[PDB]
């Protein structure tokens, strides 16, 4: 029932699964 659609600007944070850290960070305002 709940839909999640990335058709507008977003953030993508790559992290460790069981650890609080940031390996990679990113904002996509335009995928092209």
């Amino acid at each position: 029932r709940t839909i999640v659609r990335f058709n507008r600007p977003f953030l993508m944070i790559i992290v460790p699964t069981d650890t609080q850290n940031i390996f990679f960070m990113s904002k996509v305002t335009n995928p092209k």
Binding site: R1, T2, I3, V4, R5, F6, N7, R8, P9, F10, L11, M12, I13, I14, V15, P16, T17, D18, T19, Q20, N21, I22, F23, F24, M25, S26, K27, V28, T29, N30, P31, K32
Partner: protein, 334 residues
């Protein structure tokens, strides 16, 4: 670790002020490891500006310690090739017939895994190819040209690279990829290959506070991709609260749930950066001026930071994700 996270977000704010409408992409780890590596041969104000710059509380931690923490993480390149690829690398291309403290040399090679390469900076056709060929090899071809123009009075160049390829635990079916709309603004849009997954149970949290939605998509290794999607016109409300506390609140609030449909663009982007201004805004000044004490390198106060450059690349496709990043600290005479 809590430092690297504070450092990542500080850096995030800075990059956005400089170009509030462009894509942002970086590896905090790559920038940190390269600034820490530089810290080996740094003394006094110079040395204390870089460590507080990297967000460490010098009351608490010793610097012999911080170096071990970086040495520790790098050791975890031990990497299990079970649908996961990782490789970090550090190097120092020192001028042919420039002498370094045995002590500098040994510390770089032992704590950071660095290697010393004799490079002839008077021939810039080549010194150039050499460093670019090094970075390309390590990133397996993604970052083809980190170094653009390079002067002959360049004494030394420090380089760090990071490569990571992984598989989605829940891969996407290319059959469910169809050109759809991606809105740059409320009234403007483009068409992008939009991948989809259906009736999938994944970590979810709807943050009414910030007007955004958070979801976690796992990779087979021990990493995850965290996606935050602000409501239209709330990207700035979110960015204003991008801090360590907020990352922790989201991760702790994530609860399993079945999503009917999930749409994600298939894309590939990269950014190029001159970090001089950003580090300056985070307080790293003296390493750039006439006052630079980098005498741990030579034994003399004859070297200064010319520039710091970073380039990062992110690929999102149906089977997984590939990202690489590189940082280079250009060093000259003082």
């Amino acid at each position: 670790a809590s430092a690297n996270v504070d450092f990542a977000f500080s850096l995030y704010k800075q990059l956005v002020l400089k170009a509030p409408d462009k894509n942002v992409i970086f590896s905090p780890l790559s920038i940190s490891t390269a600034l820490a590596f530089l810290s080996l041969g740094a003394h006094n104000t110079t040395l204390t500006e870089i460590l507080k710059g990297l967000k460490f509380n010098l009351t608490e931690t010793s610097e012999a310690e911080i170096h071990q923490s970086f040495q520790h993480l790098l050791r975890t390149l031990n990497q299990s090739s079970d649908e996961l690829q990782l490789s970090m690398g550090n190097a120092m291309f020192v001028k042919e017939q420039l002498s370094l403290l045995d002590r500098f040399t040994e510390d770089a090679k032992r704590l950071y895994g660095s290697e010393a390469f004799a490079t002839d900076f008077q021939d810039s056709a080549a010194a150039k190819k050499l460093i670019n060929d090094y970075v390309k090899n390590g990133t397996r071809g993604k970052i083809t040209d980190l170094i653009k123009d390079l002067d002959s009075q360049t004494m030394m160049v420090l380089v760090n690279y990071i490569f990571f390829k992984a598989k989605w635990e829940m891969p996407f079916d290319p059959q469910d990829t169809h050109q759809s709309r991606f809105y740059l603004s409320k009234k403007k849009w483009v068409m992008v290959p939009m991948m989809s997954l259906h009736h999938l149970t994944i970590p979810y949290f709807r943050d009414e506070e910030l007007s955004c939605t958070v979801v976690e998509l796992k990779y087979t290794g021990n990493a995850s991709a965290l996606f935050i999607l602000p409501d239209q016109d709330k990207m700035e409300e979110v960015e204003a609260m991008l801090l360590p506390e907020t990352l922790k609140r989201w991760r702790d609030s994530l609860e399993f749930r079945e999503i009917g449909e999930l749409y994600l663009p298939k894309f590939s982007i990269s950014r190029d950066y001159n970090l001089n201004d950003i580090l300056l805004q985070l307080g790293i000044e003296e390493a750039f001026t006439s006052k630079a004490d980098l005498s741990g390198i030579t034994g003399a106060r004859n070297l200064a930071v010319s520039q710091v450059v970073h380039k990062a690349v992110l690929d999102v496709f149906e089977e997984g994700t590939e990202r690489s990043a590189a940082t280079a600290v250009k060093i000259t005479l003082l």
